[model samples]
Target: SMRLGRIASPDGVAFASIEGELDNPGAMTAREIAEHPFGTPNFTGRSWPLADVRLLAPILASKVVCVGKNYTPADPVIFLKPNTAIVGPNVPIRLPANASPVHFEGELAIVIGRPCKDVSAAQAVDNILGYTIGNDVSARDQQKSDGQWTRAKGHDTFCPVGPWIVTDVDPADLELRTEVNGAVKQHARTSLMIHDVGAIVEWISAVMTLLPGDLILTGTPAGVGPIEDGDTVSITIEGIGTLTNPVVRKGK
Candidate 1:
């Protein structure tokens, strides 16, 4: 599969091609492939060691659409997280003050390659650009107290996504894993979800238009739990790679 992402360098931030395997990926020099409609980016001959570059969230979406409890729901429970909530790889997940019991929900995020609306489940795959790893970090106490999930899930850095977006792979049946400070906390497969990827795209699209770069987070598997300050949480999806973020108390 091919991968694409944005990186920060001495020059500036630009879309880049990610080469090699997930564990040993290479970062290649890049230039704008296109503008406006967001075309595929072009890569140059120059390259950098992946560890040497600062990675940014691969895609900046207009809005982040999330599905909750899709594994066994009568209908998908949907929610929205503002684009401002997203943070890139290795960024800090700030725990809001007085917000206890922060939780991590590792999910497979779908990146939209093209815009579409009112599409059928059979046709939804055509609108997708690729897939990436996402951590749907939440303030569980606020989630319960607020009734609706906005403030609970809308905190800055709550949505930690990407190492890179992997194109050209089946999202079905992939193994998903999450770790808290090096300890495995959640493990499951995409095959276990009650609502498959295509169905999710179709269901959401019927209600709203999905723009290019829009994100759809398929629900996390069971084993949802809390994250503490100073802990590092990593979510890895088979073929997609790992998205790791550190937890820090707000204002600290």
Candidate 2:
């Protein structure tokens, strides 16, 4: 698989192509890719052992449009999380003072490759850059009360994505597991989705343009629950990889 992600070091950040498989720590390296990897890559002739750099949220989306809720598309429900809500793996998902319960929702995310609108389902895959995992962190209390879900899911660090992006795997039928601390909290397969990727892109693009670096969360599975400050959350997809983040108590 073409494993890709953004990494940070003493020099700053840039897109990278991760070489070698995940388990072999000593063998892996993150080769910096000049500019963006939207198309062909231009390596910067520099690399670091994977552990030396911090893996960032694969993409800094201009807009993160999320769809459904273990539900379908006859008109699939869609909402957007502000870019401020995004955080990379290992970053803290801060708890707001008033939102009593916040849930961690593990999900599949699609990375748009080009700016497109009104594209058909068949054309959707062609416009995609790759796939990544996302955690849709939601404030359950705020979600039920808000007119829209902006506050409920829009807190800083609420959206956790990364480890890296796998550019080759098919999203269909991949198993998903979300773990809270060491216990598995959510488990399912992408095949169980009511609205698949092709349909999702077709629906979303019709309403508005999907810019490069934009992301769309496919939705979460059945086992959803709140995560406390001292806990850690991890979302692992069979084909992609794992995204882990720690929860922090930032306020009352």
Candidate 3:
């Protein structure tokens, strides 16, 4: 399990680093990020050495591309949360003034190591570099009201991921947890996924092309509710370590 941190500094720039079990399959691919750098594909010289830069999401991806509502007793539902919706550990999740009853869903996220189109479930694992825990922050009230969910689910800081990406993470019976402030909100296992990782990867690739750095949030189990200002949300994955941060209200 590699613990990676994506950080920003007082100057407001971000960079990433690896921690704990430093060696993993996602290392080489994720390391490529340190080269080009920034949230976009552009040039920027290095500034921090795991000390200076503030933490952002470890990988700046093309799109978040998560599976919506895929972890229930009923049929699977898949949807995408745009790249703008993502943030990193410790960052505040803005509660839009209009939306209410928002919730935090802790989940296991798959990071694609390379590109693949129409890959099989067996091959799906092959495309994966590793796994990281993700908090699928949602605006529950808006989500139910708006027939189409792009805006509600795609707000800034809605999807919070990483602390590190563990290469070849064992999804077998892994405990997924959510704590709001200090109380337990949700508890479950990766095994609870209605569509397992292999099946999800294969199914999604069948529709849209899966590329390197793309994140697949395998869906969250029930027991999700809203987060508020000054709340600390911590999500831990068994064997994968902890991804913890505070929840804050957005400023004008």
Candidate 4:
């Protein structure tokens, strides 16, 4: 297990297993590896401190499987986000000109390590590569009227992922917080999840194949609210670094 970061080093972009404490800026380093972290890392012998490089979305997810109001129904409300919806940490979450109020729903994301299907709650863990933070940005008016949520949830920058992924961490009971313009908005814990990670993964994979790099959004907590242009949103969990996105209105 490793704390993996996809970075743009001077040599080129590559997956690197991180070293040193995350908060320790100058001391923290990234060691370039020969392959993706889902497989055993083959160190390429290039190293750089965290400051010198730009971090990209750790995984270029082919499909982002999402859940809505996880406490509901036998199956839970699972949904999908197109690859176009994803942007890495610090990218702008553009506010659509047509959609009235945009809401930011921060949740923990499960990164799948390999293909899985019809697995049990316990078996779901082994299928996972690690965890990352996700911001499920929604267009409120579209959600209320369309009733079907594709347009509400599928904007180009609607999904924000990373800072990075942390492996070998327990999802249960970790603290989760989201802030808007430096004010605390949503504060809760993963323990609040009704179905939890195991049941979610087990229930989901039963319906389809979960391939490597697929992301499962576990649903957001309370205090689900709006964000406007010029505002910044930051979501943080225990070991995973804070994922922040500035709000913009490019559609204007």
Q: How large is the C-alpha RMSD of every model relative to the true structure?
A: 2.1, 1.5, 5.3, 1.5
The C-alpha TM-scores of every prediction are 0.93, 0.96, 0.81, 0.96
Q: Write the per-residue lDDT of candidate 3 for residues 1-252, one digit (tens) a residue.
A: 344445565545444434424334232222213442212333244434443344567767777777777664554467888888778767788888777787888889888878788998788767876788788888877878887766667888888888666665777578888888778888888877878888888888888998888888888887787888888888888877667777777663
Q: Ten consecutive residues with minimal summed lDDT in candidate 3?
A: 23-32
The sequence of per-residue lDDT tens digits that candidate 4 reaches over residues 1-252 is 678879999999899887887677457888898875797778999999878988788888889999899532356788888879999988899887777788999999999999889989999888999999999999989989999888899999999999888888899888899999989998988988989999999888989998999998999999889988899999998878789999988665
User: Mind sharing the TM-score for model 1?
Assistant: 0.93
Model 4, stretches more than 4 Å misplaced?
71-74
What lDDT would candidate 4 get against the real structure?
0.88
20 Cα displacement, candidate 3 (Å):
3.0
Which of candidates 1 and 2 reaches a greater lDDT?
Answer: 2
How displaced is residue 168 in candidate 4, in Å?
Answer: 1.0
Per-residue lDDT value at 165 in model 3? 69
Residue by residue across 1-252, what tens digits does model 2's lDDT show? 488899896678999998887767457899999965988888889999888988888897999999857532356889989999999989999998777789999999999988999999889889999999999999989988986888899999899988788889898899999999989988889999998899999999999999999999999999999988799998999978788899987763
